[model samples]
Target chain A: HTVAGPGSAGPVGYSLPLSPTGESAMLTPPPWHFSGEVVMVDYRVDPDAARRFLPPGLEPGADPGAAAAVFATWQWCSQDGAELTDPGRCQFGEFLILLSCEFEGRPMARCPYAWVDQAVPMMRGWVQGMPKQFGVIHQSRPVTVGKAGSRLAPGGRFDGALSVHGRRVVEASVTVDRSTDQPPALHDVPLAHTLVFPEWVPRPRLVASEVSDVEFSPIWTGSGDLTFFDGLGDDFGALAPLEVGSGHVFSYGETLHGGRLLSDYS
Target chain B: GPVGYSLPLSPTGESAMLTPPPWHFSGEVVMVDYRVDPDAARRFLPPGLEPGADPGAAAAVFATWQWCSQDGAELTDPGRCQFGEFLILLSCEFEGRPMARCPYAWVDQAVPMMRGWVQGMPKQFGVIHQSRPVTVGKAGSRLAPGGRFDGALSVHGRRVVEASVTVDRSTDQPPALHDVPLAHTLVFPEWVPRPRLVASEVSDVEFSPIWTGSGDLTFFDGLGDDFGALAPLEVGSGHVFSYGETLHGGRLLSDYSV
Candidate 1:
């Protein structure tokens, strides 16, 4: 699997994110690189609902309600760094719902839900065992001029939302406080995913991943309000926040090399 | 700008890739119409789906395809267009209307896999091959009566299914067993964040050299497949046809949570 290209075709030399050569895929090969601005809202959700959302083999943390919602705007590329110039291939937005979890008595986190505004990331995430769906993710950014222009220092503000079929499922806003750099509780934990594509792989296995090569700008932690809506088919409200917590805004870079399997899915 | 949520990243997302479909295909199809034990076939229906008017009627179509863009760029871009596919369509009913549900589908390439997913098709990877009719060659079969063709599909190196047909005559019509309805019960459920059902339609259809013939189909026992579960109670007539269809956007019949 060294120097793998996109798609599940293996050494067949063809797949999604395809190109004339295996090198310049629509979804370029790994280091599945990314650069982005993030708006993260940490909170505690309803334990009852969170429990129902967890899969059979996963266990809830000490407080199963501990969760987080992440909204991001990304410009991604392969190691070649060519996607930055390819507008259609580089841009996308995402919203993910993360929950505290444990497997085999080992503490970690898991993402049971997620949404993306584009297909590239949607398919890519699926390949990584992320439960990505089709949806719209929008966020406001600071600019250089005009009344709408904002700064990234104290009093800075950002707004973000996630919608499916034009109905908002998650909405949040952040007003910056002083810098307090730290990793998110929900994200700090190793995350596990059940990689199941019954036809492609005979056995459903568990894959666990944590961020690496992590770097971030001065983080601005602040007060935030996060709201979840129970839309028609988007049951995002299942994990509705019982109490919202600190919000953080920052730009980041990271490399997702890949992951390790925790065990075979029994 | 491309118009897909997925790939090819083309100007219209119509360039023989996935997304914003209205697909164009040129292929040779070896299909068999058969009758299965209705009770046995029902084992394949998903939660909300029911058997169609004649549950016993089903089909197995094995094809080698070359899907192209409107401008035909894919003819040269074989990686994006060429594939071999197999589908097992079971007669099913939805909202009191007859429909076909593809219980098991296999493809040899990614383009077809991505395209099939958009329609809620669960496509697996398999090696499929079929005999192509040639105008003149020692290894080729003819297009007229008496022509013989065969196709086989395998997974994990296990031959799951195979078919052979010998042309008897040209047909003005298809067997009544295939007359129920043409719509596939496209469905999307778990493994996705939302469950949905899509109602699709096709137009600009064209088929030529539809040679009807006597045929035989065999589904071998397999460890991990459902093929053997509904093996034919009686194999019937078949046809070899050159076909194409433009499959456009579908209606959002239902979007609900299970």
Candidate 2:
């Protein structure tokens, strides 16, 4: 007995292509990579505002009025690592807002909304069950504190702006006062999501997941600001900023690429 | 939208979708979070990067990941996306920015090796192992009898580090997420004189939380002499366990010359 090779109509031989071929390729992960700057801030929000967007079975954590948002600018690349000189792959951006919540007594962060400037990650995130949509995300270039002797003090600033369909939505900023010899604790909790794949059976699933062997560092703490616009849509409009909290930023971090799927909500 | 020059498109005119519509990943990771004398951690950082004001403490993670595709398919494919990895991070600062600096990293696969290298993670090739037969007790109960997470690392047959942790059930309030902030620095020693030339470059990255339980964590010494400089001292251990996904995207935040 024989199997048909990939891309062939023959019924006899078998072949596995590096990536899916044909129109099905639309479902494949992008063959590109990303590296760049990110600005993340956690703020206090009205619990009522958070409930407007959160689905049932998920409740805001004990910490009332908590929200975390991140704006990132990226340099893209082909799988072969061509980012250094590839103008096409050098610029991409993302914005995400996470709300603290509880699921089955487990603390989790649910991302009800996210925005990506590029289609690669936009679709990639969609396939991974993230609520990703297209938008314009702008972040300042890397701000550097000059050498110690220079009159310019050793400090930097990061800023990000987000707009969807030409409508302004969110703005955030972080300012570094001085480097702390100590790093702050970053919440290590599950990411809870509601995933719906209309084309597939078993659609509309609740996903409780986590990635293993994570490593994050260089946590910089400073003042941060977040503002949400009204009249845009449910996701952004519901985020009425009640107050702001201390902002922390990470320079760079990574985790191994696999994770566990704890449970599914039917 | 004509097929213009943009991302999500290959150099050739074609849609760039990650084959296997939905990707699924699972793995076990053992981490050792401990403190070192602040001065000792400072000595390990490369030029231009300073240790944060916090006590000199670091977390070392060793784990194996098995990548699969769609609805749990492709689970048996060995070559697809399986990797054993290791990383050593020091609490440090750079250019007045507090961040974690990675002096050494090792992964056994090409996919992550390239991924880490592109991000300026200082990743290299090395062998890593995690104890098999991961035993667990009844759900909502402490880990089963003899339940433990063990891992080790080696380079050129030389042991670099070893760690083991035992899981336990606890009713304590999980630590607040904001209590810890994680950012990292990537260094490229070769790129000199250029604007991009630097001892460290910062990238934006984040992780997801899965299960938050507690456990007694410990690091084994003497097996790996190279790690001695950091001075791993077991101050206290509680049940702190988490599993989650991580997203890597962002810009280079710093570029400094030696």
Candidate 3:
């Protein structure tokens, strides 16, 4: 059994585009659905160190100098909504981000850097000016075990980690606490980028390029332990937690909700 | 001027100190100024911070500090007293106040590493070199002939910056260290609805003036990934050569939630 294509009388509706393009209709109104685990770790570092990586007009958050780093693992499916096992219709990937930015009078999460495993999404990100690189990411599936009689018990857990250039940079684990009926607040954070497309003639350059309408949501929440190890061989080490302030584990979903180009450098 | 204590001190020297200890420095310093693309420069700034009137420019400094002291006591450890350093200063405005913001800094030693961070300077580990050869507290020093100053900055085995300035000796003035105020924003993004602002403290520090000179500088391009955006179109260059000491102290000016 196979899904139908565009203009065909079928059950899956219209076939979706497989690549990223600059065209409005081809890009906007694009929806994404995924199930994943997200771990957010709030940590402290020299605020000046934080500013070194931020763009102009976007200052670091104030007082004790706090920053949030996140690790996410997901089974991503098309907006048409397909089964996890569907062929050429799903992707498994992970990413890490530092929530350390304020833009246009509002506080937003800026990805000083990030990594993704799959190429398609990576290309999509680059085209959109998201600072994403190619790397390996792993997320442990919910593990369940049961016993009966003398030592009868049942247990389940989830773990996630990210590595780049063959070095483990971040790791996180959480217990399956409980599912929540309440949906987490969806934050539609604006992302700023140093938009550069070298291939473009005259070299498109937008020093303060931004994309709006990006959203992240939490579907499940639980206590978890997150560790940011020294990335001895990568620049990501700059973000290694000097001291962890708090840790959170969540099973979440994310929606791109499409995006609009905000501004140009010139 | 006396450096005042903002926090109480313990007799045992084990009290909670409010700031990094002051370190006296004796070294030769060189600074070169340049004008870069303002748009590219703005891309590296955070919100509430605006580029200075001359938006598209910055200054770079290379120094080889030979000796450092704590409480007026010279440190014998080589690691604590010696290191080469590089800094990039962008003219900026914060809260309508004119200030110089350091977007990047590199030091070869750990002492400056920790102190720079605590002082709101974005310090990183890098390799730095200076043109002149001088010893700590030693009078005799050799300078490169032709009034030239040469330096390079590298990170992760890649050279990011290289510069050579030809100084015109006829133009010399008493080293005057400009009191350029600096500020930094501290952010905590986990405060979901809005990230929290931890602190925005200005450093209470004094700088010794640099003997001034006019010069022509040539900057080479290297390690193009992170810095290529602000490639310089060298409008002009000025030289500042001096030795100085720094007194570090500051209070937590303000703390608030975003």
Candidate 4:
């Protein structure tokens, strides 16, 4: 009569996003699975600016200016197939600002600010310690039919924008010019975060977690430009891009089980 | 120089709903001691924690709280600091020590809900209320022989855990809350495959006069709330007490897997 506890056992089952019975939860227990189409805008910033946003104990990355702003239209689900039939549960839009940081000399990528279009995903991110907020995020997608205007191919044009309180805070655009099998170097470095909950950090610690089954489509890269504008509740503009690099687009999917603590800070 | 994390990101981490810890809480509690389907108690516990401190025990506490982070500003802001909570604390053993864990908890506000998750309690948003005594120093709600108070926990408007206690006499003894050490699992992404245990120690504990007597408690399982499944098999004495306890980073008690 019960498969609600972690690893599927226990009583008075409970999980995220309001499933009081734990059984009827909007987000079933595990897998924390997510798949999406991504628009990644690479940028350059001053090391001092990167340092400003870092959670305590992190220094600027070796080449600190290598920043990134990522946008995605995602579908998240669990091992159960409900999302396959439930359209509303599977879809969401997200925008992330990643800064380069060094955790004891190890180059890492940390999401300084993140915004999602829906509240469910925002809570979902909170459990993962992502700095997620509620915002109106819009991004373009390639279509299967030529009449749809954009194709997931060379020469494809993509755009992503995040608005909060009706003010656009981030804008990104890219024209796909070349294709490559290689992923960005940032992908190989550690993905870092400071998980905060009233309990987790009486004195918070840093976490570097790994994603399993990380699959990526061949990346399309081309000239790109990104802008951070004044908006309600966002300070993304504080790290104004000093130089814009190429933008990349791909289809990505992964499973997040969880991560372990890295180090404690002063 | 944001040093920690909480809702509403701030440069200094001071201006969010749950600012940096060690978070401080002060409250009044109406606690009831009762017995439930022993089997149901086991279901509330994650593995590695076993029941049997007398094969485990259960108590429900309804509380009114005022909280503030390290800055201490929230205490002055009544809207942000005041809230109500209801929870069941069950006894369990972790590697031979008597400890307690909350299988379910409900809070009327955002601050406590988030605060609970951080400490490994499975807390959800719900409306909670505890009857307080107020009068012209006259009849009802007074703390005399046979004096009484009431409390209830509701979710989606369904009243699930309802309790009331009658004062038999005042006691100098500590309330059951101070007698147990709380065991909570700290897992990010909330629930992880590998469960870890932490002993939630309450310190700087201070309490006012306590009243003890028989109490009536009820549980009704509804849509997302499962209190009915663990409904008490037998009822016992309850207490009306005013108390304060502080929570810091607890000691990690066990890690079940790699």
Q: What is the C-alpha lDDT of each candidate?
A: 0.76, 0.54, 0.57, 0.78
Q: What's the C-alpha lDDT at position A206 in model 3?
A: 28
lDDT of 1 by residue, A102-146 (tens): 888877888988898888888778777888899878888977677
Worst 10 residues of 4 chain A by lDDT: A11-20
lDDT of 2 by residue, B1-258 (tens): 534222366555345333322333344445656667677777766556667766466667665565434443333223345677777666665567556666667888865676555455667888676543211211111234334545667677666666665555333343322123334455345743333313322122222232233333344453355556664665333222322232224354445544
Which run of 10 residues does model 1 chain B get worst, by summed lDDT? Answer: B176-185
Q: Taking the candidates in order, what DockQ does each have? A: 0.01, 0.01, 0.01, 0.01
Worst ten in a row by lDDT for model 4 chain B: B220-229
Pick out the ten consecutive residues of candidate 2 chain A with the lowest summed lDDT.
A143-152
Tell me the docking grade of candidate 4.
incorrect
- Summed over model 2, clashes come to 53
lDDT of 3 by residue, B169-220 (tens): 5333422212456554443235333322122332333344433344344444
Candidate 1 recovers what fraction of true contacts? 0.00
Model 1 Cα lDDT, one tens digit per residue, B1-258: 565557556686655345456768777788998888898778887655678788898888888888865666667877767999988888887778777777778999987886787777778897788888889767878888899999887665456688998988987675443343343346456663555665566676667757989989998754364567778999988888877776666765556554
Error of 2 at B256 (Å): 43
